[PDB]
């Protein structure tokens, strides 16, 4: 049918999305999955949320990414309003007004990461790696576990993704370009790309690799 998760809420807010669900015969879970069809976000006045994991895996799945107000209104008018007219435009980080999920919902015939071999390297925070990996898989990259697992050939296009903050290391991440032959960039590359569903490119994200 439908299936939901929420993000950014509070018990009372949540209780309220429940009310919605109960009434409308909608399924409501803790945890986003293949099958989750909606993602209800805390937003301000006019549909800017903050950037959370569910936020991204939201867009990645081309799921319905709608601001809490869908709910409270659909309650207030005692029926189900158009997800169509409630989508989240943007976010505090990536612009109040960037049509993210829009692009994404409709661009399912051409994922931003067509023909990419991505590899999330070294440790991340607030975001389990496997979830990051799940994310790019969702935009039709394909995941690599270790740098030396990169499909060689001119065939495809590899990229190493790191996030420098979670490191304690000096011989660390300036040095990936030695252990192979790929662009290296920050996780921000992926998130900003995914936010906008606009495949950013990498000038601004490159990490300086020791030759």
């Amino acid at each position: 049918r439908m299936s939901m998760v929420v993000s950014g809420l509070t018990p009372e807010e949540f209780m309220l999305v429940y009310k919605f669900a109960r009434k409308h015969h909608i399924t409501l879970t803790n945890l986003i999955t293949e099958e989750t069809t909606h993602v209800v976000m805390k937003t301000d006045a006019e549909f800017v949320c903050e950037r959370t994991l569910k936020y991204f895996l939201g867009i990645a799945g081309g799921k319905w990414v709608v601001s809490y107000f869908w709910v409270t209104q659909s309650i207030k008018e005692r029926k189900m309003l158009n997800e169509h007219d409630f989508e989240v435009r943007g976010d505090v980080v990536n612009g109040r007004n960037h049509q993210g999920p829009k692009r994404a919902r409709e661009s399912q015939d051409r994922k931003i990461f067509r023909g990419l071999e991505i590899c999330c390297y070294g440790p991340f925070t607030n975001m389990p790696t496997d979830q990051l990996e799940w994310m790019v898989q969702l935009c039709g990259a394909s995941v690599v576990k270790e740098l030396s697992s990169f499909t060689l050939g001119t065939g495809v296009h590899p990229i190493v993704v790191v996030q420098p903050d979670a490191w304690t290391e000096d011989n660390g991440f300036h040095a990936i370009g030695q252990m192979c032959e790929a662009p290296v960039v920050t996780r921000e590359w992926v998130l900003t790309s995914v936010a906008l569903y606009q495949c950013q490119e990498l000038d601004t994200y490159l990490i300086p690799q020791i030759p």
């Binding site: 950014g8 959370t52 994991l53 980080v93 607030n126 975001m127 998130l191």
Partner: peptide, 4 residues
Amino acid sequence: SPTF
């Protein structure tokens, strides 16, 4: 939830 964390944010980004």
